DNA sequence: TAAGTTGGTTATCGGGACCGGC
DNA sequence: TAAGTTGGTTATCGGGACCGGC
DNA sequence: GCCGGTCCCGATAACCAACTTA
DNA sequence: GCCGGTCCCGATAACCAACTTA
């Protein structure tokens, strides 16, 4: 496709530093932990002379001559609305992980699930009993139930989705609470149902 | 080109109302701020019975209706990198968004400028003094001079820079601690 | 903030419906 | 979170360099 | 309206730590 | 590397408050 065959830009000194030096050291200290011989290795850098990171760092720039010319050819024989479409690629692994990255610090501030719906109760109940052996079929058959009961049926859900409705209230007035204990006012919503 | 042309979503019932009810109010009231006629407008929306906002839904659900068959014709005649490129638009109008909101924030919470650069205090100092009438000359030929300084000249501007760096410092230290007191530590450096 | 490694935890995306915040 | 208005600020973009945070 | 999380789990693709330069 | 702000200002292109539905 697109993004799959363009150009990457070259590596830092220190990167293709790493890259060499990290297979001489697992070798030579086989049982060491991946993490531990980076740490080693960084110290190797620091340690390095001037003279000898200059070599390091004049491939480096020579590469990013190489990298400009490249770059240059490659968006020379696309359209503009492609190179808008390579842009977008890009953009999207950005957001993508700041994505993750937000969801995993609200993970680890504790922050409250979001209410079930009375659907996601019916899910919880009928799923190990479920007409399928693949979780995909088991789910598209419990979906398929779920559609053919009457609203006298769903009172059951309906009634344990009004609950965590109000789970979900305490939790989160909690929660918030608590943010502005640790300084995080950013965190709490501007809107409440 | 691509985004312009692109069909643009039905505003809703209430905001049919207000385009509406805006003219004739500007008319009862002319010397009144704009912004206090939205808020008696808006009032009078509430007020209104549900049998006549009901008339605003329905026009609106029937122009909803065109929006989908319009978008669809839309997409149909563009190519897979025009579709992107149309996303990848809407995401940069977002984000540009997010961005202005961002720094009119930080303005008001009254965040330390940034330290200006030596090449940024000799252009405060030699500017009225350059030889030109639009800004655009005068600049021009304030970087050619700055290009053509030596060391020694420079050093004076090097250290006015230095300076800066040194109030930086002071101001954003405080301003920090005085963020995480009103509870803003998402406003913190990672770095230095 | 992103790249290089590499083994050891967490997305994604399958099949859908649905609801809270923005 | 975004749309409508309308008069009233902040982008933009000209000419360039450059540096702090990520 | 739209995005994302929510119920389930099994699948593989993408993470995380350990560093630094640009 | 890349983005954005910074010195300056001059025109013009897109913003702010005031609301609510979806």
Redesign the pocket.
């Known amino acids: 496709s697109v993004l799959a065959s363009c150009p990457?830009?070259p590596?830092?000194?220190?990167?293709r530093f790493?890259?060499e030096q990290?297979?001489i050291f697992?070798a030579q200290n086989p049982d060491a932990?991946?993490?531990?011989?980076?740490?080693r290795?960084?110290?190797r850098?620091?340690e390095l002379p001037d003279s000898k990171?200059k070599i390091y760092?004049d491939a480096?720039?020579a590469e990013?001559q190489v990298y400009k010319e490249e770059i240059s050819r490659f968006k020379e024989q696309l359209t503009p609305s492609q190179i808008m479409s390579l842009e977008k690629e890009i953009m999207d692994?950005?957001?993508?992980?700041?994505?993750?990255?937000?969801?995993?610090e609200?993970?680890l501030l504790g922050?409250?699930?979001?209410?079930?719906?009375?659907?996601?109760?019916y899910?919880?109940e009928r799923?190990?009993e479920a007409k399928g052996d693949?979780?995909?079929?088991?789910?598209?058959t419990?979906?398929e139930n779920?559609?053919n009961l009457s609203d006298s049926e769903k009172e059951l859900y309906i009634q344990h989705?009004k609950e965590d409705?109000t789970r979900?209230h305490n939790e989160?007035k909690s929660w918030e609470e608590q943010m502005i204990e640790v300084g995080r006012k950013d965190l709490?919503?501007?809107?409440?149902?």
């Open positions: 990457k830009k590596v830092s000194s220190y990167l790493s890259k990290l297979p697992k932990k991946t993490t531990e011989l980076i740490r290795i960084a110290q850098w620091r990171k760092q480096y720039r990013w692994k950005h957001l993508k992980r700041k994505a993750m990255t937000k969801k995993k609200l993970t922050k409250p699930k979001r209410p079930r719906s009375a659907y996601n109760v899910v919880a799923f190990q693949s979780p995909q079929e088991k789910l598209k419990v979906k779920w559609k989705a409705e979900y989160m709490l919503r501007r809107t409440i149902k």
